Structure 1
Amino acid sequence: KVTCLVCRKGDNDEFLLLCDGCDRGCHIYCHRPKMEAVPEGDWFCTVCLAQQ
């Protein structure tokens, strides 16, 4: 059940990015820098980025 790392909510799930490497998520509107849309391809959360 995906939830936003920033605000901790799982609401508005059409706007939740799901990490490609783990179960974590983020609303595009909670992300900084700002994101205007859900991107295609792969998005990695900061925990996954910290492992690469």
Structure 2
Amino acid sequence: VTCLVCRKGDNDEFLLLCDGCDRGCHIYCHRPKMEAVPEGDWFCTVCLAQQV
């Protein structure tokens, strides 16, 4: 798994994994600000584009 924004896979305890696909994102690369790893489901922007 690699971060969509910065393209690195380091600091994996900070690295969110998408519940709809194999993609990821560091909480510190997310905008708007994300202080912590959320408890519930997280969907990347590519999965959001499939919603209705």
Q: Same fold (TM over 0.5)?
A: yes
TM-score by length of 2: 0.96
Structure 1: runs of 5 or more not aligned: none
C-alpha separation in 2, matches of 1:16 and 1:40 = 14
Runs of 4+ in 1 over 2 A off after TM superposition: none
Residue segments in structure 2 that go unaligned for 5+ positions in a row:
none
Structure 2 distance, partners of 1:43, 1:8, is: 19
Two-structure CA RMSD over aligned residues (Å)? 0.4
